Structure formats: C-alpha cells, structure tokens
C-alpha cells in the first residue's frame, strides 16, 4: 500500500437494523527510521527552510489507502461502512517484553471507538451520556498541587509533560449508619503559567485601563496566562466531551479561589536564582537594574506586593491542541467551533456551522439547558492565536528528560540577553508574519540555546476561550444545583 510508515489498525463494529457500521483506530510505528528533512518554502524576501516532523506526512493519500485496506478487511462495500475514529504516532520501540504498553494502547482504542458509536447512534441505540444531574446526591470537592522540582507527568507513550499545576476533582462519600469516610477520584488536569507582553498606552488620549472596574498602576505591563497541557480520567472508565467539560469547570473554579494561581509564582520564587525566577521582572521595573533579583528571603506578602506592580490582576485561559495523540480525536472539537458562520446564502438569517453547534450543544447538555438561557446563540466561544508550538524533550541536568515547553518568556529573561527576549516575544505577537516565519524564528532560538541536543516529536496549536462565555458557563452550572468545595 502507498503509505510512508508501517501501521496497524484496530477495528470494531456495531449493527443497527440490517446495516453494519465499522470504526477504526490507526497506529503508525516510526521507531528506527531516519527523521524527516527540511522543506524549502517561498517567502516575501526569498526562500526559507522549514522544519517537519512525523505528522507532516499524513495527508489525504494516506487516508485513502487506510480506508481501502479497511474495506478489504471486512469483505467489501456491501458488507458495511467504515470510518476513522482516531490516530496516534508511537515513537518508542516495541519488543517482546512490552505487554503493558500494548494493553494501554488497546484500552485507548476501545474508548475512542465506543465514544464514536455513542455520539453517532445513541438516540437509536439508547445510550446515555454524562451530565451534572448524576452528581445531585453527593458533595464534589477539589484539590491543587504545586510541584516544580523532579520528575514530570508522562503521556501514553512515555514522554514528559509539563505539569507545574495539577488539579484533581473528586466526590465525597459517607456511610449512613457506619460513619465511614471515603472519596472517589474522577478527573485530573495539568498546566502552567506564562506571560504576555502588553503595554498600556496612556498617550493616545484614552481612558485608563480598568480591570474589574479598578485602575492599575502605570508600571503594569504583563498579562498572566494559563496554558492547559493535558486532561485524563482517574477512576472513570469512559472519557467523553461531557467529561472534559466537567474537568474544565472544576479547574476554573479552583484556580480563581482567592488568587490561587499566583501561588505558583510565589512558590517558584523560593528556590532563588534559576530558570523560573520571577525576580527577573525587576529589570523590567527599573531599567538601571541589570541582574535578576533574589527573593528567597522575603515573606509571602512582600512578594505579592512586588508582583502587584508589574502584572495585571486577571487570568487568560488557553489550551494546547495536539495534531495527533491519544485524545486528539476528542480535542479537535475546539478548533472546529472557531468559525461561527458558513458564508452560505441565507433567506433571512445566516447559516451557522456544525462545529459551533457541537460545542454549544455540549455546553448546554452538561448543564441541563441553563447555558442557553444565560448566553446568546451565535456569540463567540473560541479564538485562534495562530501559533504552532513544537512538542519534544531534552536531557536535564538532574538526570531526567524534560518537556521542551520549559522554554518560555521567563526562561529567556533569566538565561539569555535582552535581544533574544525581544525576538521571542516578537515571533509570538507580530501580525505581519506568516506561520512558517514564526516557526523558523522559534526553532532557531531553541537550537542556539540548547546546542542542538534535543528531539522533536510533534506539533500543537494554541487556542483561548472567551471570558464572557466562561462566566456564563459557571453561572449556568450553579443554576443546575452543582457546588464545589476546594480543600487545599
């Protein structure tokens, strides 16, 4: 078959009436092959060489060949219908002593196939889905852990994931007569905190910047941002889009409980001089200062007061969506809702796209129909930033492999010189740069910093939510009888 890598497909079926429906999960195996070369592209000035990785070879021809193989497997076109349910690249070698990995991959394939069958044929097959009404007779709780020294979280293949902040959502149970106490853990979420340059312009004869109706000091110029890196079940067997919505609600509620997100920076400040020191902002505040400040001998309130002079008192919610992986089939719904309107001719009212409909329907179904009453139909839900982020790992000085996403703005402030900081921020923010140009700039900086000792595995795109939609979602969840009690 005309395919670039050896692949294995796991198939399963379902029958409605007299028809058969088949769904497949695709697994390319690439361990032991040479990495892809660079591709020459066309730019406004001239030609540039752009990096590529494994996923860049999976085009429409590959899909057609996989479909043909699947149809030959079941017997023919008259024996049923076939559809693709997911895709994931396996970058680690498989030997005769890899039973655990095989079992985990089989479980992931089964969950994806079953969820596809439910979404497509639940009404005819009578299959229910999760909603907040099932948590009516119990007490949900939450917890948060700030850890930044040592090993990190890992994915299904075994590669590290950045996990500065971890949030766990559980359920509290008490026996009626025997008085025993227990808890049941449902879902978990990981992420970290980044910074975005955003100066305020007073000289344009505009009004002062107001956050929550309050003015801010003139020296504030950086906007905090939260980036979600992963979400996965703990004791639940099934993980569907509704379960993802529950995880999102829990994370938002926990992170805003008394400015609990700033505890991450305060905790990082305790190590002293290092790649994650928030004291590097002292150079931003006062130009004469040329060396990052050490804040390990200050009390917590002093550090909080220092941070209040340079940061906006609000949080931006973002997410990284991988182009392939264990849960990419689930998370592809976020990019699909970015385009609200198909430009199709309308007799009166413009037609609305299908991805927007799916995301709105999920939000409304989890909350039992209150979101529709709180938020207007057709308002934005998701924005696109336009940045393509690399995925990979490198060797840390403590003996472990670390996520390549450790290189961010604070790392550049603490490790490199100001010219590199300007170049990094510019590739993240300038609007007159194409996607390939930004990719090239970031790749060059990373390669210079790490001396070329790293490995790339994939790509991801970054999206962010609309704050008004999130506020409406929290209010609708409250109106459906759901409450949460953070414990930490």
């Amino acid at each position: 078959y005309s395919v670039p890598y050896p692949t294995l497909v796991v198939m399963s079926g379902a029958k409605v009436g007299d028809h058969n429906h088949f769904f497949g999960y695709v697994l390319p195996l690439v361990a032991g092959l040479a990495p892809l070369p660079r591709r020459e592209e066309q730019g406004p000035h001239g030609n540039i060489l752009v990096p590529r990785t494994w996923v860049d070879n999976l085009n429409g021809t590959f899909i057609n060949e996989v479909m043909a193989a699947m149809y030959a497997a079941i017997g023919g076109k008259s024996n049923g219908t076939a559809r693709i349910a997911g895709l994931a690249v396996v970058t680690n070698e498989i030997t005769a002593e890899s039973a655990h990995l095989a079992t985990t991959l089989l479980s992931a394939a089964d969950n994806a196939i079953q969820t596809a069958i439910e979404i497509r044929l639940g009404d005819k097959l009578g299959l229910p889905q999760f909603n907040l009404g099932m948590m009516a007779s119990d007490q949900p709780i939450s917890s948060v852990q700030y850890n930044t020294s040592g090993m990190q979280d890992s994915d299904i293949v075994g590669n590290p994931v950045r996990s500065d902040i971890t949030v766990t959502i559980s359920n509290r149970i008490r026996q009626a007569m025997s008085d025993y106490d227990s808890q049941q853990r449902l879902v978990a979420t990981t992420g970290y905190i980044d910074l975005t340059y955003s100066p305020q312009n007073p000289t344009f004869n505009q009004g002062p910047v107001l956050v929550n109706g309050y003015p801010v000091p003139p020296t504030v110029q950086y906007q905090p941002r939260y980036v979600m890196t992963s979400a996965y079940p703990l004791e639940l067997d099934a993980f569907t889009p509704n379960t993802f919505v529950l995880g999102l609600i829990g994370t938002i509620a926990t992170l805003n409980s008394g400015m609990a997100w700033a505890q991450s920076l305060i905790s990082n400040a305790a190590r002293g001089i290092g790649p994650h020191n928030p004291g590097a902002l002292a150079m931003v505040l006062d130009p004469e200062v040329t060396a990052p400040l050490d804040l390990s001998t200050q009390t917590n309130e002093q550090i909080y007061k220092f941070l209040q002079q340079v940061l906006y008192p609000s949080l931006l919610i973002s997410i990284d969506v991988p182009e392939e992986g264990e849960y990419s089939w689930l998370l592809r719904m976020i990019p699909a809702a970015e385009k609200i309107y198909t430009g199709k001719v309308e007799g009166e009212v413009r037609e609305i796209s299908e991805g927007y409909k799916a995301l709105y329907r999920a939000f409304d179904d989890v909350t039992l129909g209150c979101f529709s009453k709180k938020y207007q139909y057709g308002l934005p839900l998701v924005y696109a930033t336009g940045n393509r982020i690399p995925l990979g790992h490198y060797n840390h000085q403590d003996g472990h492999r670390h996520d390549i996403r450790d290189m961010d703005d604070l790392y550049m402030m603490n490790i490199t010189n100001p010219d590199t900081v300007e170049a990094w921020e510019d590739s993240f923010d300038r609007t007159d740069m194409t996607m390939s140009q930004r990719v090239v700039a970031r790749h060059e900086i990373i390669d210079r910093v790490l001396s070329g000792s790293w490995e790339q595995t994939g790509w991801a795109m970054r999206y962010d939510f609309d704050p008004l939609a999130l506020q409406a979602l929290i209010e609708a969840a409250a109106d459906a009888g759901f409450t949460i009690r953070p414990e930490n």
């Binding site: 969950n111 229910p128 099932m134 149970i173 049941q184 099934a238 569907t240």
Partner: protein
C-alpha cells in the same frame, strides 16, 4: 457510586488486586511444613459481605 455500570467500557485500565488472597497464601505456605499446621485459623472479612 455506580457510574461505571451506567457509562461502561469494555476494557478497563484499573482492575485492582487481591491482597487478602496473596497474604493468606503466603502464610499458609510457610506453615505447611512445620508442626503447627492446625494451630491457626485464618478469617477473611471483605466489604462485600
């Protein structure tokens, strides 16, 4: 409590273990060769009953 039975999946990543079966087996195996085979009684109590 019964969410898994409602929203079920065929293959599960968490199966649990049998600590009481493992510990009882080891103790009986140790005792089977000495002269105190009949001096001990092992009782298993589990939440299912």
């Amino acid at each position: 409590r019964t969410i898994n039975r409602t929203l079920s999946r065929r293959i599960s990543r968490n199966t649990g273990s049998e600590q009481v079966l493992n510990l009882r087996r080891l103790m009986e195996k140790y005792l089977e060769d000495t002269r105190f085979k009949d001096d001990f009684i092992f009782v298993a109590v589990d939440p299912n009953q």
